[PDB]
């Protein structure tokens, strides 16, 4: 919910910065001169940057060796069909490259197989000047490397086509991460319109980073493969380590936990990693069931949680959610819900992004007005 707190950083800024330098007069000549004897060399450009440059396809050599004796003459010798089909096979990659650049106007994401094959991506990702642990992480999970990469059209001139691929750099490895899921916590009185609700707005990923906690408010953007959480620090907040204190005492004075309030008590369910949170309200009927045994549990009004052991589907009203059958141990912490401590006559239910301190001071101001 806190996605509006991010700063608007241009992701393609580095790639377009390198691309702009290559547009300067003479830089393409330097790229050709440095790549003259080898397939990979680091070139120092006018900006002072040193970027590794690689050549991935040379259709010039193929054409100038095989097709010049055939099509560049008056008395054309008849080519074999093997040459024709080999030419389509070799040129197909360039046709898909140009098609993707045409459709996406020269900035493509994710990096497709035509932008960079997996063998060339593995070679280039091993050739980066980085630590061995980073190389191991990158090589074992190249698909998320593709999903977090851009390919930027740069130049086409002097018989040279160039596009700048922009691989991610994972500067943080194996720090502990945890995902916070949140469901609306509401009262359960029988009167329809007297209900008040409270929802923690700080749902999303958290990962340790250099003595602070990187909070990622958009959980859908972060990819998860098995036990590993692939996130981006560009769309992240930096938070003090007091943010951990919200999960054990939401009323702690060191860090004000962020919540939103309303009065729309809707029956909803949040499928967590190892269970399901169901918040059944009003006259809605909510149950958790086993695929073979039928209904095994019925939820009373309020906030409740069911483990993934035994349960295969969960139904809340007319919508059915499937629970994750991941292996793992789940714990239920009994406690009085915090919504019962608020006076319904003075509860401020008009906040879209607030905190416990803001709600408390608003309640205090409302009591002072009385």
């Amino acid at each position: 919910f806190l996605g509006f707190l991010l700063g608007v950083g241009s992701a393609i800024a580095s790639g377009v910065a390198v691309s702009k330098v290559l547009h300067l007069e003479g830089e393409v000549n330097k790229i050709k001169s440095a790549l003259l004897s080898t397939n990979k060399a680091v070139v120092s450009l006018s900006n002072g940057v040193s970027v590794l440059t690689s050549k991935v396809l040379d259709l010039k050599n193929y054409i100038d060796k095989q097709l010049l004796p055939i099509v560049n003459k008056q008395s054309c010798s008849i080519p074999n069909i093997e040459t024709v089909i080999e030419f389509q096979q070799k040129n197909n990659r360039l046709l898909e490259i140009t098609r993707e650049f045409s459709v996406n106007a020269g900035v493509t994401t994710p990096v497709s197989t035509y932008m960079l094959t997996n063998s060339e991506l593995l070679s280039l990702i091993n050739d980066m000047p980085i630590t061995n642990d980073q190389k191991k992480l990158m090589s074992n999970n190249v698909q998320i490397v593709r999903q977090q990469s851009y390919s930027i059209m740069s130049i086409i001139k002097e018989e040279v086509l160039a596009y700048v691929v922009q691989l991610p750099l994972y500067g943080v490895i194996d720090t502990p991460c945890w995902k916070l899921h949140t469901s609306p916590l509401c009262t359960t009185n029988t009167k329809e319109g007297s209900n008040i609700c409270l929802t923690r707005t700080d749902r999303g990923w958290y990962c340790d980073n250099a003595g602070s906690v990187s909070f990622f408010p958009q959980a859908e953007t972060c990819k998860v493969q098995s036990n590993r959480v692939f996130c981006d620090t560009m769309n992240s907040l930096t938070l003090p380590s007091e943010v951990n204190l919200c999960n054990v005492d939401i009323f702690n004075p060191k860090y004000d936990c962020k919540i939103m309030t309303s009065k729309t008590d809707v029956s909803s369910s949040v499928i967590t990693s190892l269970g399901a949170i169901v918040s059944c309200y009003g006259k809605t009927k909510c149950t958790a069931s086993n695929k073979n045994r039928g209904i095994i549990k019925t939820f009373s009004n309020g906030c409740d949680y069911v483990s993934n052991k035994g349960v295969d589907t969960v139904s809340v009203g007319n919508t059915l959610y499937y629970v994750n059958k991941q292996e793992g141990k789940s714990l239920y912490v009994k406690g009085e819900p915090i919504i019962n401590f608020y006076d319904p006559l003075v509860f401020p239910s008009d906040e879209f992004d607030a905190s416990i301190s803001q709600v408390n001071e608003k309640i205090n101001q409302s009591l002072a007005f009385i």
Partner: antibody
Framework: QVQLVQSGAEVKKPGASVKVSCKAS????????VSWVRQAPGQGLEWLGW????????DYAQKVQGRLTMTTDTSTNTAYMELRNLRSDDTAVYYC??????????????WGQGTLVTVSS | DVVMTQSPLSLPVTLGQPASISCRSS???????????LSWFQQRPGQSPRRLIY???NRDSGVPDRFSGSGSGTDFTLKISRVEAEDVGVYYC?????????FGQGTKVEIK
């Protein structure tokens, strides 16, 4: 002009270890790498091992693996090659040849003047 | 791994006559990124070697136009148009396509 100025000749006892330096001048060393090659007298030229000053990757010929270790100190623009446990047949001249900073086609464009390491009883 | 055999083991030459050195290869040198990488080096007696030819039929900077490369695929040949006093030495061909790079037998040229 780019030249590769190497160390002088060394005479040592069998079983000890050598260090051969190949100083590079005229270019940014961090943008390339150095491959050492052995040239025994009356014998051809054999590639020993490639080390990049850019990423620190290493590769060694299978006949030499284990005994060979290269360290590059880009802050002094000189690359060292250490050969532990010399045998009798390792009396040779060691040439350093420039190479790309990544796994790609070999260049060997610039060659050092050599370092004659001889082991005799 | 690949091995190259440099066929003309000895080079008796006469001044003003051309000389050719050929070295066959056990595999095709076409890399996936399609260039053939075979280079020729010249080594003077008691001096450091220097590259002459960097790709097939390509001449390195500072090398005189007398040296010229030729061939493609698996048969490569270096042709010296005229032999002089400053051409005495040994020549090596080297492939960069496959690890490890290898060198020829080091054929020697001697003026008659």
């Amino acid at each position: 002009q780019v030249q590769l100025v190497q160390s002088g000749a060394e005479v040592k006892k069998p079983g000890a270890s050598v260090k051969v330096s190949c100083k590079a001048s005229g270019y940014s060393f961090s943008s390339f790498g150095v491959s050492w090659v052995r040239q025994a007298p009356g014998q051809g030229l054999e590639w020993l091992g490639w080390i990049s000053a850019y990423n620190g990757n290493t590769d060694y010929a299978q006949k030499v693996q284990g005994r060979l270790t290269m360290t590059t100190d880009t802050s002094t623009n000189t690359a060292y090659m250490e050969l532990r446990n010399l045998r009798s047949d390792d009396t040779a001249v060691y040439y350093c040849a420039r190479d790309p900073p990544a796994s790609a086609a070999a260049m060997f464009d610039y060659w050092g003047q050599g370092t004659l390491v001889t082991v005799s009883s | 791994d690949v091995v190259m055999t440099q066929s003309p083991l000895s080079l008796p030459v006469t001044l003003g006559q051309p000389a050719s050195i050929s070295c066959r290869s056990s595999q095709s040198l076409v890399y996936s990124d399609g260039d053939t990488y075979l280079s020729w080096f010249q080594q003077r007696p008691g001096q450091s070697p220097r590259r002459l030819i960097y790709k097939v039929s390509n001449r390195d900077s500072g090398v005189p136009d007398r040296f010229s490369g030729s061939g493609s695929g698996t048969d490569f040949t270096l042709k010296i148009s005229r032999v002089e006093a400053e051409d005495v030495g040994v020549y090596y061909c080297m492939q960069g396509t496959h690890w490890p790079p290898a060198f020829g037998q080091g054929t020697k040229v001697e003026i008659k």
